[PDB]
From Swiss-Prot, chains A, B, C, D:
Modification type N6-succinyllysine: residues: K256, K363
E.C. code: 1.5.1.6
Protein's job: Cytosolic 10-formyltetrahydrofolate dehydrogenase that catalyzes the NADP(+)-dependent conversion of 10-formyltetrahydrofolate to tetrahydrofolate and carbon dioxide. May also have an NADP(+)-dependent aldehyde dehydrogenase activity towards formaldehyde, acetaldehyde, propionaldehyde, and benzaldehyde.
Active-site residues, record numbering mapped to chain: E269, C303
Protein name: Cytosolic 10-formyltetrahydrofolate dehydrogenase
Residue(s) carrying N6-acetyllysine: K478
Tissue and organ distribution: Expressed in liver.
Region annotation (Aldehyde dehydrogenase domain) ranges: 13-498
Compartments, record wording: Cytoplasm, Cytosol
Domain notes: The N-terminal hydrolase domain has an NADP-independent formyltetrahydrofolate hydrolase activity, releasing formate and tetrahydrofolate. The C-terminal aldehyde dehydrogenase domain has an NADP-dependent dehydrogenase activity. It catalyzes the oxidation of formate, released by the hydrolysis of formyltetrahydrofolate, into CO2.
Entry-annotated residues carrying Phosphoserine: S225, S227, S421
Source organism per UniProt: Rattus norvegicus (Rat)
Length: 498, 498, 498, 498
């Protein structure tokens, strides 16, 4: 029997676990320490959540180690591992409205969006990777023969072992699902650190692993302080791989701790300042719709959000006019209300940063066209924002906002290489986009953009089958697609002489 | 005109460059600083070699950056990049005797072995990867369609950019070739740091890149201090990937430096304590020949050398007797002499470490069966050595010697899981081996060994098509095979809506 | 509402469709023509089944064409095609006892075996291939660039279109599932011809496609005459691929008809005379168990059944003695009885051939150790049979029996190449096996056997992930594994200049 | 010494073998039967060439069988097979002017084109496939385990054995090279049937295989009658695969003969009626240049030649005007004249067909804009021809000309699906093209075109890495790219229990 926080909302009765999840059971942290998780729609405390301590991290790693080395997970067929992951996806689907409601409460995700994306894509992710389990294959290799004898060389793809994964707060369940599904599909066991500010869907997910019959200890979840849990996971002698998505400075530290302990494998996704280049020969009304999506989707809390729009001189003014017309139609409100287009920001500290960000944009001389302020209502709502006259040297041309702030620069009619240079000036390299009807411009621009993803006449079109990861200081390693599996596998070469 | 050290030796005239190689030219280091490279056959100074300074590292990176961003290498077809690498292999082949002679002088490699292995495998490496250039392919991926519109998603494999590679002293040209060939085949440019004690074949190789028409700046070579050059490469903001083979502590530091600078990609190969398990049902005379080679090949200076032999009780004494008989037949001497089959150790400090290693072995209670001492002749020759009665807690059971020291433990007749546990009780995981005629034992043992390579009824059977790399604290990433390319490529996802 | 033949049997109420299945509905054949399907346990008529006419074949092809060109199947996402195929597998699982009972009645499959293998593997097949749908990927290829312009070349994997598949009678549902799952996973639509003698599980399967929500016309099933339906499918101008498993002479005709109509693609699996080589150093009791299985599994109605056993001289007599002891323990009986382990042969005409086969074996001088005759009881039961003193020139050493007839030859101690030559002296090449504890012999023999599958220390170990198909006159093309998909896809190369 | 026909021409002394090439030697056919090969520039007899008889075909197959089963080719490492194929490419390059001259003489190939394409691409082909030899890899597959036992399942890629390949007359050496390189790279041996009308570069190639050190019998070449040699190869019990490029009716027969003999594997490329769709938003002058090349390249003797041009209504008349202007500038003449743009047709009978083809086009109502006749001058020259007012029901809208005949239809301004329907209304499916600056049209059209290759804003852009083959009645199987290898390999599944 699990302890829950019960809540009647959205025509459901939510039952929310709030404790650490270690070895198939929900347990208090050492000293029964807790912290408050805050609802961004009104600033209220949702509930108290267990605050994982170093001893709890050790317990979680030990449970994952045992599950991997001696438990059922390490013994069953790849095909049967796949069956369990497909069952997990089914259980998630059965609980989809509840999960989407929890995400609306915990992260401010608009419910309709949380259903379709935060939860919907999570279910797709588990189903996709479940299909990979019995399709992960090694090789047989035609090596030179040690005549008069013969040789056979093969490779075996094997799991890496116990993994630690650190999940950001922008799409809590979805980002958890991306990493967890690939990790588990490859035969590993895992200790998951959800963001301090967004523990709840991870903990509901933990309960669903029980319902799906995932062996105890395969999944362990440790809400609490990022510095505490992330550091101990990265230092731990029994952890063999860390997957991290978060801030550049924390990621650098994570990688350093991986090095200095046991040279564990690491993948890093460290956000971006992603350019979207909009040419005068695009479909303009479509460019307005997709340009707005590129920035405002999920209240801008989106690692691949377009952090700069470069718009060709001849359509610039009309583009901005149309964006403003459409921004005015956005319905700001409670994420549980069906007419809501734009939900609150995730947490208060982030709201405060967005306010300071726009103050600085104005200070340094950009033109504030609309927004830039906290919406006058309870909770942590921020007005969709449009800046123009942004120059390359400006802070807002360089720094990632992680909010609903469209940052527009002009470029001269016909100036392809020049605008590419400005778009590529960043040390980030996560995503990018180009809008043009011209096939030659589209293909050339996609070649030249220094980013892990290039969108052409679309934006935010991720897919569980399409690898996602950054270049340069956005990190390395892929989530999603076949490529994600390689981060969670090791290759053993076996060479016979006969 | 290039400055050479000229030497008439081994029926040829050596012409050895001795300077830094930057942007297609041989140049003195800052301040014309140099150091002596020493011949391990007689302790003599071969010549003075340029000692790279920080400003020289920066010049080399700048040359590699320019070659990659603006030079011919980044413009030519993949097929034509292949042609240049195949031409390079041809040039190396035309100079095979010269290269093998330089390796014999600089590293103490027995000339006949250097010709077949150090040089022969290097030529195979370049030819193999040359063939990959126009066969590196991305994907087209069946993503969900944004109906009523359509989507196309593809991936492009692109070069990572400027790479830094740090090469160990065990097989100087060969380890250089492993990394450089995969790096260049993927379309990157490179700055190479050969071991301080073994610069000469790297510098001759550099000259050969001119003969082959590799564009200026694609290959840059910086002999000197490992701390200086390796540190600056790992710190440098324009370097995007480091490939490192060397000691665990240096490797950990390299990875830390990659993290704290610009989160550049890193691969590590950090040596091993590789177990070889010899069952009573093996072919015993063959086990003696292969077991000896597993330890003594290339005077033990071999990252995959068997660092422990576990020998089944019932054959142990006969195995040791046969080894001793064969060790006595070994011809120790000048590596240029055709009868020689055991060359000198690479450098004096390493010889002194081997002497101390065997002293510790004796002090802690292992039985010194034969060897253990410096051979009383000029140079740095060490006796092929056999220890028995080695227990798991012993220093020599845990520490990598990197010398010709066979370290034998018994295991009980019929035990399999017990000996596997002992074999796996290292934090290393580079290689391993098993000798048995029993198919069931062979397959089970290969499954259970926690190592990147498992040899069955052979040892030291590497092949340019077969990936090589470690698990656990031996590091991560592969050299050789198709898999090596992935360390030197990035994947760009391009997603269209139409 | 669907017309059923209802039967109370095996503690179930079977509801069996008996009509053609065209465009999502069960319909009578032209002129309401029918034929009788026969229960091999007692020779009784189970029911009348529709007898497809040429006009019915055309209707089925027209339905499949419309479903492919204009229906939902050609429009939905690959991932959603996968979902439908998973759902189909789930529906099959929900009906597993009913399907297995139908197969016992129609094919004489022992119920316990039909549940685990005939039906169980069919469910695995659909789940496996469902997982492939969104993981079928094309390439991006680094072609030479038409400078000063650029080129992009990609490939797109596309469905082939309307396929005809002809299914044998030995494992009716299972063989249907092998081909249908790969065909549908690749996005094609299909017209299925089940063997005239085994229509019933195919027709129940058709009903289950309705339950699973497979769009109308995607699956069409035409029971009746093989010559009529097979010929028209192979002749039809709108069919683009035929997949055929059956007799050599029928297969050759099918391929000829594919050629002379519209050069439609074809795959063929034409049976085997598969050798099993048993060495004196094998585990003898295990060799007896697996050698028994190799011949007697599914009453020998198994395309990969071992059609010759070569047994090393020194163990031959003991092997035969042990086989006879095990054969004597086999319980022959009604497939629905739980203690039955040998069911009746599939149909009367086959039983007659088996009788003639053993008459000829005796005529030509083989030693009949046991069996060789129809069991005195109603239905079409054949006594498990063992022949020894079989010489290479004999009919029974060359011709496939497809029945429970073990055909044993000796080979001299220490011969390996000699026995291989004899094992390879067939024009068939479907499967083979070797029993030995010697790793060197196992690997050498597996290299040298001229067969599409080689079993080592096992037999009959098929798996939905492991490709199955023959060499030489056994045909070409694979069922199962990733490889099977290639038979049902085409590759389009798209090359841009920009 | 080899017997040569010697000719002083093009600054060279050509030495042309003219005999059958069997088991490494040039030999007369049975009865010393010969036929004349004719120079299309002047109608003169070049020389007499051996006329292969059935006994000669059997001798060739026997030599290939011995070379495969017992000779060095089947024993050497894959890497060393690669080295030999690279060496062959080097030898071809050393003889490139001689080969191009022979092709000018025998096929009427314009010398400058023969150097760059006919010979140049042949050299690229051998170098490309040489690189594949040691990169052809099988798989290790995670099958369900027979607990408490374990299973290992792997695949081996193996050669198919003796192959027969039938080569067309349009690019004699190049088409030979496409097939032969992939065949040999996969480890097979081959009997090659060059077109009766174009034997000479095949026979010179045979001599070059001697110079390259290809083992005797690996390559055999049988000039003579296509019906005789092709029929016997397709019937032969020791041939395991036929690769055929040629006419539909002959291809159908070849496939029938493969079926009725030993169900040998077959690939077919049977020509095309390839549509090129030119939209008004294309770059018009470039469309004229590329549209002309799509038809007139290699005097139209090109299986992927655009056989219909659909030109959008608003640009049709200007397009036609520009084409006529450029056609008038084409230099028609001797292939050895360095300013020749348009050489003679391959042989007289083809010239006569082209004359009749154009008479039929005019008779049925198409408008002859220019050309349509033999050029009055010695040899077999045909005028570059342009037809307009071509309607979908016309013979010239359906039949492949294989000559320099541009066949133009208008399509309606702003229409896309209607023109696609018309372009797809052939039973051929080899190639296709689209010219448009609109990325959306380009991507949609490339999806919808029912052809094996789609060119976008280019034409005739084949590449040795890019697979080439048809759909529908154009055949099946690919030449070029990794995909070509699969036609020449078989897959063996090996499954162990341990």
């Amino acid at each position: 029997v699990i302890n829950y926080v019960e809540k009647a909302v959205n025509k459901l009765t939510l039952q929310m676990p709030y404790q650490l999840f270690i070895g198939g059971e929900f347990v208090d942290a050492e000293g029964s320490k807790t912290y408050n998780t805050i609802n961004p729609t009104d600033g209220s405390v949702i509930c108290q959540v267990s605050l994982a301590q170093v001893s709890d991290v050790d317990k979680a790693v030990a449970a994952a180690k045992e599950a991997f080395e001696n438990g059922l997970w390490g013994k069953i067929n790849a095909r049967d591992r796949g069956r369990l992951l497909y069952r997990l996806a089914d259980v998630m689907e059965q609980h989809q409205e509840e999960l989407a409601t929890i995400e609306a409460l915990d992260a401010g995700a608009v419910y309709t969006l949380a259903l379709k994306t935060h939860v919907g894509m999570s279910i797709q992710t588990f189903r996709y990777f479940a299909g990979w389990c019995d399709k992960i294959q090694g090789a047989t290799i035609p090596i030179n023969q040690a005549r008069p004898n013969r040789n056979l060389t093969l490779t075996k793809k094997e799991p890496v072992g116990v993994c630690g994964i650190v999940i950001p707060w922008n799409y809590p369940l979805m980002m958890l699902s991306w990493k967890t599904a690939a990790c588990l599909a490859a035969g590993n066991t895992v200790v998951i650190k959800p963001a301090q500010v967004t523990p709840l869907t991870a903990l509901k997910f933990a309960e669903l692993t029980l319902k799906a019959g995932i062996p105890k200890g395969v999944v362990n979840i440790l809400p609490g302080s990022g510095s505490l849990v992330g550091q101990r996971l990265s230092d731990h002698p029994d952890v063999r791989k860390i997957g991290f998505t978060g801030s550049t400075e924390v990621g650098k530290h994570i990688m350093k701790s991986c090095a200095l302990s046991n040279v564990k494998k690491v993948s890093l996704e460290l956000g971006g300042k992603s350019p979207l280049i909009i040419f005068a020969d695009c479909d303009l009304n479509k460019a307005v719709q997709m340009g707005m999506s590129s920035v405002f989707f999920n209240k801008g809390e989106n690692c691949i959000a377009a952090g700069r729009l470069f718009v060709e001189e001849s359509i610039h003014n009309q583009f901005v006019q149309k964006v403003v017309e459409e921004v005015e139609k956005m319905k700001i409100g409670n994420p549980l209300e069906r007419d809501t287009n734009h939900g609150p920001q995730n947490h208060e500290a982030h709201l405060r940063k967005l306010v300071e960000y726009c103050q600085r944009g104005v200070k340094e001389g950009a033109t504030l066209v609309c927004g830039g302020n906290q919406v006058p209502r309870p909770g942590f709502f921020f007005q969709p924002t449009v800046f123009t006259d942004v120059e390359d040297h400006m802070y807002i041309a360089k720094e990632e906002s992680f909010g609903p702030i469209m940052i527009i620069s002009r470029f001269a009619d016909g100036d392809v290489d020049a605008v590419l240079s400005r778009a590529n000036a960043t040390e980030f390299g996560l995503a990018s986009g180009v809008f043009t009807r011209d096939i030659n411009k589209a293909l050339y621009v996609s070649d030249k953009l220094q980013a892990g993803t290039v969108f052409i006449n679309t934006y935010n079109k991720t897919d569980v089958a399409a690898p996602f990861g950054g270049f340069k200081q956005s990190g390395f390693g892929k989530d999603l697609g076949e490529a994600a599996l390689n981060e969670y596998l090791r290759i053993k070469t076996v060479t016979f002489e006969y």
